[PDB]
Design a protein around this nucleic acid. Structure first.
Lengths: 834, 166, 50, 865
RNA sequence: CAUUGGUGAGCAGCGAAGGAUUUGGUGGAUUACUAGCUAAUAGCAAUCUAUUUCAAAGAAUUCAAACUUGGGGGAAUGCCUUGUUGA
């Protein structure tokens, strides 16, 4: 139950740093803020590493065995991770801002550009145990005078070619005996040298600078001493070079500028292969595949990530995330994708497994405040600050309905009917609730009676009663349908934000500004029970404020709560960096999750380092923005009293950490939280955590495979259920023959029914045994499908996971074979003559 | 941050600027400081004007002018991004150059911007004053020093000093 | 735009605009983002719109 | 015994053990290398930060260590190791069996004295290399010349000579010629220490009666004598910043400071270290500096500083006494109890027999801090009792930390030796709390626990009575009386709903907690000594007196495992954080790991010290053990966090031993089975035209015009694995026999052999662009052989019931690409018969259709209605 | 009669060679521990100097550069751009 682990981070495909591919370039590793996301682009899936830097990460590299990663943040705290085990091996603090880190091609050394020193360390093994100090320093070279901007290893891991802000580039041999082969420095650029690469044969050296010159250096005579043989210029006038890379085997130089334009050249002849634009923001990262066929570009201002094949002029993916600006989320009615309503005015539909956005919708001209699904994933409603609720067909991708009021107000929350005739929406400046029909477009009613801004709306999913709750300390229950026009006001102790509604519509849980979650019986309007949550809330201290995190009143309450689908738990989040989940019978905290440890966000640390507090102000409120290398980030265009507007440049404070929406998954035992870093997805998995169910001493994996070998199949299945071990359940499940699936499925005891149903769901989504899984589903639904119907909310997430398998792989296969049957019948039954 | 140092033209007063914000005007040879002000944006340089009684500091963008005890007298709306200030004491002129390619002479007594000159050579990497004839030697990213006067809108002389910048 | 951001986007919306939108017909595969997958393979026009 | 789960990482909490440390000086900074048993540790003397720990444990205890500029010379059992940055650079084996026990390093020479009064000189090879490496000669101090060698030093400006300080004599050797230059007169008492003065050719000798001699090693006389009666002298140091002070260090723990110029005594720091652990073992002035670093055998390293003088004219006569500066320390006695403070594995609480509770950091050893015992004020305003001479609390039996409400109120609840109340502590403030929970039955506290709401603490007394106090306000809430003999274990659910107690009368009581009822009581077959409750899986383990570990769940109150195998009393045990293993440790010097799923012993470690405490981290990172000897905490890392270990029992279905089940490829030949691959491959194949049309950019990129035409083929020499970079292997149709592709050649060969298994293997192998480009080029013109070979290849394919969604899309791609030619020469005999037998096998695919129709219809009916 | 108001005079109780309140200074933590300096594949750290010099490499008609201006109106003399006369 309560044993959730950080699974995934939807949204935010790129934040800051360098993109890396794999060696067999199937996955790409993308630095999201202080996590690292890895997107597998062929097996369409994605994961995020569990570990967490304390600042935004700035460098990524993993060796070409694929076996370990090293990630450095923006003040040099490196973290070495085992890439296959997904566990962190070492934490190593380099003392200053490291610009690049690279492994050797032969994997055994890595080097990094810390300040103006190139330091080469040698890679610890993945097979060795963790030591106190696994890194053994090879050397540290200091020949540059200003900071080093780039590394490049040679093809043999023998020389390393580094580029600096100082207007040179240098070549260093790895070992001391070849010191005479590599002692030269490469002058001649007017600006920062952005890259320096070898050719395939390591005879030519290309050095690309910031102003736009690429120099070809050759070991020629005018003795032989590395002349410059040709200077080529990009002649991009206002823009200048932001990122350079070179695939030496295909002779492909890829260059991204500060204007979104990137050009890619065939280098020693300098012929423009292609030139096209990501956008208007600068291209912060270019990275290239090992075969040189894919180019991954990252722009850091809009958080966007392309990977683009330049032969077939086509985007493998062109994605863009949302940092800090995400107002709402909603799971699809099968937990396959999450719809995100974001403050720059748009809807984005993110697949969960493959961590990418399928569709985006921009018809709101202001910050979209709420999304909500209806008509079982066919329609989706959203309300924004531009005055409109509007409806979206997720088949034809059309905004087919737009609902406005008559009073020019901005809508902050909505609620749809189950039987989606009526949409409903509430504002924070109008005190009314606006009731629109969906079939016609008209304003059906304006419900009145709150004396404070209607903070939250929800329709009961079963008996269809409306529950609104507002800042006049009052939850209110409206019987709209059928001649009633009945209003029942329940008062409560303080002003309400985030009501939520049970899946059976019996009870309603409200979150209050005191810090509590009260739970009320709807039909008999009396309080069933409350949780007191303001003392298990992690409220950090901001940098600007002059009052401690203990005495602060900023975030000791939950602005979003949500029921579990068995009705037994509540997940909750707010403007604090803890999300907490409880079980509502016992009103006790099951688990509290720290949503960020990034010190680049504001409300993370409860106690701020007193070294940073000086005789006039803290040292993190000092703006060091004019110490910057160029005008576009020396610029301050932040109009003064702006909080929660748009365009993070226009607010002047650090982005605070907050969760704006929490939701449970409708199909598989997880929840998504819309934080500022992205859509944090926390999920359990049954592979770990031995948690048996009434086993005795004679219940053993050995006993289960003896019962399987002796072919008591029902006894082996219930022994594996009492073990609750996923591999054993899978082994017995596949070993039962087709001849006696229905006998076993009829003799399964009723306590092991949700276990076998949720196992069949989470197995059959990705397993290939489609007819076996459908035989088991047919046998279970036929043998025990009355117990399910009279215990709906137990199998409410195990049955939604099963019809996530039938309509999403099995029905697609059945559609293909049906079309083949009918095209056969046409192609042989009719007349093709001339 | 790193402290840009400046002395008054008789050696009585010292004016230090931290890179972060810390500007202190002081009598370094007694133990008397007369301005310690923490201007929390990145300051770059400062100079005295005709006295310890007024000093000009080059801040994040705008050049500011402070009195003896540190109250702000002026925020100069011109002098957009100074990195180098120098006072011409016989002419009463505050001379200003920086990341813009412009050189600005500002009369401190009247209050009047005397000259704006396009360097036309990008940001001004170095700057010095001839104490003999008050012409300004600016060093650019060409390796070129140019000698300037506030009368001619072109440099009086352009010398090719170095390679790279100056 | 900057008045809304300065006002910290509590504002009062624009009055009304019954505008006019032309949508061509196309696959909703093509109306999507660039990623390996898709979500729906319908056509953007209804049968009663064709 | 080597292990296969846990591998040794470090032994934290150790600072010194009373080997005289060495100081070294890189540039103008100083480092301090102290021995901790078999490793040394380098500290940054300006801030006492741990720079380095030696990389491997030496095979015996380090007994004499010195430090020149970058290198550290550590002498253990027989040999001298030369270390740089922890990593050992060289190892000098001596030719004796005698234990090397002193050493000096000067010039090209390293000189190491053994305990049979022989001295081994080692020489550099060429004076530019870094450390002395080759054997040079051997010197011997026989019984005529002097006693046992008590120190070995080189006082400066002495060209390749060596001052050897024996117990009675001072010899001076020339270590190039191997000669004994000068032997002094005898000394009337045994000299214990020596230190060279910064005065030229003067050494300072410290005797076993109380006197410091200032021997002049060139005149052969003694310059002066300083008498400290009844004090054995263990250290000597000199101040070298223009103040001529000497600092002597006395084995009753005293540091006495002398002025040598005006012959007075400046100050005495009394009880600077414990006499029982050796007194002050090494004290040295960092040279040029008024700061002196002391270290003692009580696992402590301090610094003392001299402030500048308070008189502005006199100065030299008004010497301000030395004050304390930074210090590092740990436990002086071996720890008695161990807990982890948080789930991040950052801090760990640790209580010792020297009556101190430390909080040690696993991340950075500077953060280790002693929890303070400074009591609060009484709540009413009355006086608190106790002695005026404040001593530490009795040594800690048990503790329980639950940082759910941390910083809010009291957080740790701890139980001390032979006293009838349990104290509280606050981990946030790192100090004691306001409450001491009484037992209310005149019995000592045998167990403590606290709930994970943080509200309740539980005391279990030796007269068998559980008392439940509130941690915020400190008052009795409830009191259960079930047991009659001592209650040794209390725990509670993660939902505060059922508590479980175990006493040493061998009954486990199960109580409801909200209601005050008991749910049951289970009588075991031995007195129970210790309980550990794994709280997520609700399984608690008991260490019984019959040397078994009974694993019992609290939900249904059954003994569910019983682990046998320990030979003596189980000292400790702890669950894995996932609750799969349980690691125990017992007085047969062993540590075992039990896989309680299978119920057997995974791994065993024979460890020489008996492990008295075992704790897992709350993540699966580390194991922390605590042994009988050793003042620190031994730290292990589980290798099963990075690999997977076999749950196969030691003594003295490989997938089921590695807890996996690789799902078999198809369960039955009469069962449809999709491909082993991504589900999206069917959709990519079926709609890859419109997907790429989506993926094109909105306008054409700006190319050049003088671009080479064969740019795709003009690579260099990570190799391309596409259909375009395909070469033919090894008399005109569409593909000759020299220019046949692999697909067309395998299709023809399968048409010969009537077995298209290799063709279908190639089809299931390659990529969607390659699949479309192979199906789109299939010779649809004159006799139609390649089309019909593909069709009955797909027939042979989907007869086998595997990859069948791919065989369905290959048929859809065939009908889409050139189904118009099949419709054109419809009623052709070969192509009509190939389609006929394809339909003959394909018409048995409606099993999937009505199977998903049943599942969809009945699932919808059951869910909604 | 209430003070759940100020200032005191005292009990009971608590109570180990004393107790309470306030404050200055310093040290250690406040992020996860791979050592100092320099001209750095090594030297120094007692010192860089009486080898610190030569050679090589290295210079975009970009011989373009305020992406940096509070609003309205103007700009004598400037300054900018374009043309023009005379050299």
């Amino acid at each position: 139950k309560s044993d959730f682990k950080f699974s995934n981070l939807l949204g935010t495909v790129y934040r800051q740093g360098n993109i890396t591919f794999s060696d067999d370039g199937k996955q790409l590793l993308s630095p999201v803020g202080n996590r690292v996301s890895v997107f597998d682009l062929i097996n369409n899936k994605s994961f995020t590493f569990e570990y967490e830097h304390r600042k935004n990460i700035a460098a990524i590299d993993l060796n070409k065995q694929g076996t370990l990663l090293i990630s450095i943040d923006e003040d040099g705290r490196a973290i070495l991770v085992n890439f296959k085990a997904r566990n962190v091996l070492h934490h190593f603090n380099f003392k200053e801002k490291c610009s690049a880190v690279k492994f050797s091609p032969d994997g055994r050394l890595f080097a990094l550009a810390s300040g103006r020193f190139l330091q080469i360390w040698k890679t610890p093994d993945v097979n060795k145990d963790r030591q106190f100090a696994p890194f053994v320093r090879h050397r540290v070279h200091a020949g540059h005078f200003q900071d080093i901007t780039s590394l490049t290893w040679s093809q043999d891991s023998r020389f390393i070619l580094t580029t600096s802000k100082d207007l040179s580039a240098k070549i260093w041999s790895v070992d001391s005996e070849e010191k005479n082969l590599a002692a030269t420095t490469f002058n001649g650029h007017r600006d920062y040298v952005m890259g320096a690469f070898f050719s395939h044969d390591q005879e030519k050296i290309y050095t690309v600078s910031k102003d736009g010159a690429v120099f070809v250096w050759e070991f020629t005579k005018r003795k032989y001493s590395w002349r410059i043989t040709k200077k080529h210029f990009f002649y991009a006038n206002q823009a200048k070079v932001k990122c350079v890379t070179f695939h030496p085997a295909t002779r492909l130089l890829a260059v991204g500028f500060t204007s979104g334009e990137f050009r890619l050249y065939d280098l020693p002849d300098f012929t423009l292969i292609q030139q096209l634009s990501m956008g208007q923001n600068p291209v912060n990262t270019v990275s290239v595949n090992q075969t040189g066929e894919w180019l991954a570009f990252g722009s850091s201002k809009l958080g966007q990530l392309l990977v683009y094949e330049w032969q077939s002029e086509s985007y493998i993916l062109k994605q863009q995330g949302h940092f800090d600006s995400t107002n709402s989320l909603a799971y699809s009615p099968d937990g396959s994708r999450v719809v995100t309503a974001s403050e720059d005015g748009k809807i984005k539909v993110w697949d969960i497994t493959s961590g990418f956005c399928l569709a985006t919708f921009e018809e709101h001209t202001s910050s979209v405040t709420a999304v909500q699904f209806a008509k079982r994933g066919q329609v989706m409603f959203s309300s924004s600050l531009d005055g409109t609720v509007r409806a979206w067909d997720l088949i034809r991708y059309r905004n087919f309905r737009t609902f406005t009021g008559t009073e020019r107000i901005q809508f902050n929350c909505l609620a749809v009917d189950p039987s989606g005739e009526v949409v409903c929406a509430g504002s924070l400046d109008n005190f009314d609730i606006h009731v629109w029909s969906v079939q016609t477009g008209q304003l059906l009613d304006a419900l009145s009676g709150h004396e404070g801004p209607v903070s939250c709306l929800s329709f009961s999913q079963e008996n269809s009663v409306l529950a609104s709750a507002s800042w006049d300390k009052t939850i209110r229950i409206w019987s709209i349908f059928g001649r009633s026009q009945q209003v029942e006001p329940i008062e409560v102790y303080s002003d309400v934000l985030a009501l939520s509604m049970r899946p059976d519509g019996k009870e309603v849980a409200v979150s209050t500004l005191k810090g509590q979650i009260s739970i009320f019986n709807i039909e008999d309007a009396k309080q069933v029970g409350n949780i007191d949550c303001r003392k298990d809330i992690i409220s950090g201290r901001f940098n600007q404020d002059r009052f401690t995190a203990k005495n602060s009143e900023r975030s000791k309450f939950f602005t979003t709560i949500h029921y579990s689908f068995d009705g037994m738990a509540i997940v909750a989040g707010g403007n604090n960096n803890s999300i907490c989940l409880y079980d509502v019978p016992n009103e006790v905290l099951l688990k509290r999750f720290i949503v960020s440890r990034n010190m680049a966000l504001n409300g993370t640390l409860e106690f701020l380092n007193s070294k940073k507090m000086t005789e006039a102000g803290s040292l993190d409120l000092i703006d060091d923005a004019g110490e910057n290398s160029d005008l576009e980030d020396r610029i301050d265009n932040s109009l003064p009293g702006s909080q929660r507007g748009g365009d993070l440049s226009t607010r002047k404070m650090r982005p605070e950490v907050r969760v704006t929406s929490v939701q449970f998954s409708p199909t598989a035992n997880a929840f998504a939280a819309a934080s500022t870093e992205g859509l944090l997805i926390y999920s359990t998995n049954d592979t770990i955590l031995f948690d048996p169910f009434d086993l005795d001493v004679d219940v053993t994996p050995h006993s289960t495979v003896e019962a399987l070998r002796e072919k008591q199949f029902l006894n082996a299945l219930v022994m594996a259920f009492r073990l609750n071990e996923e591999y054993l359940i899978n082994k017995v499940y596949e070993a039962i023959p087709i001849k006696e699936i229905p006998l076993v499925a009829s003799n399964i005891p009723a306590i092991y029914l949700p276990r076998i149903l949720k196992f069949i769901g989470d197995f059959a989504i990705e397993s290939q045994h489609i007819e076996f899984n459908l035989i088991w589903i047919k046998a279970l639904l036929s043998a025990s499908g009355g117990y399910i119907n009279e215990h709906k909310y137990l199998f409410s997430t195990a049955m939604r996971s099963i019809q996530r398998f039938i309509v999403r792989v099995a029905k697609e296969v059945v559609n293909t074979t049906t079309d083949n049957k009918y095209t056969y019948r046409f192609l042989v039954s009719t007349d093709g003559s001339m | 941050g790193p402290y840009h140092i400046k002395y008054a033209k008789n050696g009585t007063h010292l004016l230090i600027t931290g890179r972060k914000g810390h500007v202190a005007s002081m009598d370094w040879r007694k133990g008397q400081l007369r301005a310690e002000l923490f201007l929390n944006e990145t300051c770059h340089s400062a100079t005295y004007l005709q006295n310890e009684q007024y000093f000009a500091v080059a801040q994040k963008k705008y050049t500011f002018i402070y009195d003896h005890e540190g109250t702000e007298l002026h925020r100069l709306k011109q002098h957009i991004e100074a990195r180098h200030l120098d006072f011409l004491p016989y002419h009463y002129l505050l001379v200003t150059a920086g990341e813009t390619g412009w050189l600005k002479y500002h009369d401190v007594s009247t209050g009047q911007l005397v000259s704006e000159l396009r360097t036309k050579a990008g940001p001004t990497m170095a700057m010095a004053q001839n104490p003999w004839n008050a012409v300004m030697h600016l060093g650019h990213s060409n390796g070129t020093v140019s000698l300037w006067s506030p009368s001619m809108p072109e440099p009086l002389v352009k010398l090719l000093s170095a390679r790279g910048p100056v | 735009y900057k008045l809304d951001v300065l006002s910290s986007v509590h504002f009062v919306p624009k009055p009304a605009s019954t505008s006019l939108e032309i949508r061509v017909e196309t696959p909703t595969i093509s109306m999507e983002d660039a990623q390996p997958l898709y979500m729906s393979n319908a056509s953007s026009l209804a049968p009663q719109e064709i | 015994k080597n292990s296969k789960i846990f591998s040794p990482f470090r032994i934290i909490g150790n600072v010194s053990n009373g080997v005289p440390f060495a100081t070294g000086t890189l540039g103008s900074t100083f480092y301090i290398v102290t021995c901790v048993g078999k490793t040394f540790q380098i500290y940054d003397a300006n801030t006492l930060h741990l720079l380095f720990v030696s990389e491997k444990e030496t095979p015996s205890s380090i007994v004499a260590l010195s430090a020149h500029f970058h290198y550290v010379y550590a002498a253990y059992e027989n040999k001298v190791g030369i270390y740089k940055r922890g990593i050992e650079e060289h190892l000098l084996e001596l030719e004796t069996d005698a234990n090397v026990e002193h050493l000096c390093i000067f010039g090209d020479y390293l000189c190491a004295s053994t305990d049979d009064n022989s001295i081994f000189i080692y020489k550099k090879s060429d004076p530019q290399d870094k450390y002395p490496s080759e054997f040079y000669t051997k010197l011997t101090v026989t019984e005529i010349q002097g006693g046992e060698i008590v120190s070995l030093q080189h006082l400066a400006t002495y060209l390749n000579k060596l001052t050897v300080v024996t117990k009675s004599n001072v010899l001076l050797f020339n270590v190039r010629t191997g000669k004994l230059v000068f032997t002094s007169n005898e000394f009337p008492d045994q000299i214990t220490t020596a230190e060279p003065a910064p005065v030229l050719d003067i050494i300072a000798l410290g005797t076993v009666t109380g006197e410091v001699i200032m021997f002049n090693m060139r005149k052969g006389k003694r310059i002066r004598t300083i008498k400290i009666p009844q004090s054995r002298i263990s250290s000597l140091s000199f101040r070298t910043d223009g103040s001529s002070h000497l600092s002597v260090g006395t084995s009753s723990g005293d540091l006495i400071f002398y002025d040598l110029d005006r012959r007075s005594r400046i100050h005495v720091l009394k009880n600077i270290h414990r006499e029982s652990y050796g007194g002050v073992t090494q004290a040295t002035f960092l040279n040029g500096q008024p700061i002196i670093v002391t270290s003692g055998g009580d696992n402590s390293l301090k610094e003392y500083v001299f402030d500048p003088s308070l008189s502005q004219g006199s100065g030299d006569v008004v010497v301000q006494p030395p004050r304390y500066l930074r210090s590092r320390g740990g436990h002086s006695q071996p720890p008695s109890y161990i807990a982890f403070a948080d789930s991040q594995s950052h801090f760990m609480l640790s209580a010792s027999k020297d009556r101190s509770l430390w909080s040690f950091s696993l991340r950075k050893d500077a953060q280790s801090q002693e929890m303070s015992q400074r009591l609060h004020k009484k709540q009413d305003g009355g006086r608190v009792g106790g002695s005026t001479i404040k001593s530490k609390f009795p040594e800690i039996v048990a503790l329980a930390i639950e940082n759910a409400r941390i910083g809010e109120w009291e957080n740790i609840i701890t139980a001390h030796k032979d006293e009838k109340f349990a104290r509280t502590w606050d981990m946030r403030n790192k100090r004691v709390g306001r409450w001491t929970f009484d037992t209310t039955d005149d019995g000592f506290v045998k167990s403590v626990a606290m709930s994970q709401c943080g509200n309740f603490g539980f005391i279990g007394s030796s007269n068998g009575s559980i008392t439940i106090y509130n941690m915020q306000s400190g008052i009795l809430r409830k009191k259960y009386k079930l047991h009659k003999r001592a209650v040794t274990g209390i725990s509670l659910d993660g939902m505060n709903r059922k508590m479980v107690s175990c006493g040493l009368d061998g009954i486990v009581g199960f109580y409801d907690f909200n209601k005050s009822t008991l749910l049951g009581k289970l009588k075991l077959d031995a007195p129970i000594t210790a309980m550990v409750y794994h709280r997520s899986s609700d399984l608690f383990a008991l260490a019984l007196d019959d040397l078994s570990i009974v694993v019992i769940d609290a939900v249904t109150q059954r003994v569910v495992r019983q682990l046998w195998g320990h030979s003596n009393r189980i000292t400790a045990f702890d669950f894995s954080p996932e609750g799969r293993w349980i690691v125990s440790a017992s007085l047969d010097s062993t540590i075992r790991t039990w896989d309680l799923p299978t119920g057997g012993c995974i791994d065993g470690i024979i460890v020489d010290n008996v492990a008295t405490n075992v704790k897992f981290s709350p993540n699966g990172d580390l194991l922390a053990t605590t042994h009988v000897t050793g003042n620190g905490i031994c730290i292990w890392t589980n290798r099963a966090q990075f690999k997977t270990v076999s749950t196969r029992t030691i003594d003295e279905l490989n997938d089921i031993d590695f807890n996996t089940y690789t799902s078999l490829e198809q369960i039955d030949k009469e069962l449809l089975t999709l491909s082993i691959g991504p589900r999206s491959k069917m959709n990519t194949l079926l709609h890859l035209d419109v997907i790429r049309k989506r993926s094109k950019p909105k306008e054409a990129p700006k190319k050049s015009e003088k671009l080479p035409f064969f740019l795709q083929l003009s690579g260099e020499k990570s190799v391309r694995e596409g259909i375009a970079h395909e070469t033919p292997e090894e008399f005109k149709v569409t593909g000759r026999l020299g220019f046949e592709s692999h697909f067309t050649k395998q299709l023809r060969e399968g048409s010969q052999s009537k077995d298209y298994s290799s063709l279908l293997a190639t089809l299931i192998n390659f990529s969607p662009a390659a699949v479309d480009l192979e199906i789109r080029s299939l010779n649809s013109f004159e006799p139609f052989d390649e089309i019909v070979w593909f069709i009955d290849a797909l027939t042979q394919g989907l007869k086998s019931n595997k990859n069948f969604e791919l065989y369905e899309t290959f048929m859809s791609l065939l009908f889409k690409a050139h189904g118009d030619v099949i419709h054109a020469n419809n009623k052709n005999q070969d192509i009509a018969s190939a389609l006929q037998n394809w339909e003959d096998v394909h018409k048995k695919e409606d099993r999937l259709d009505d199977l998903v129709k049943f599942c969809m219809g009945v699932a919808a009916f059951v869910t909604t209605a």
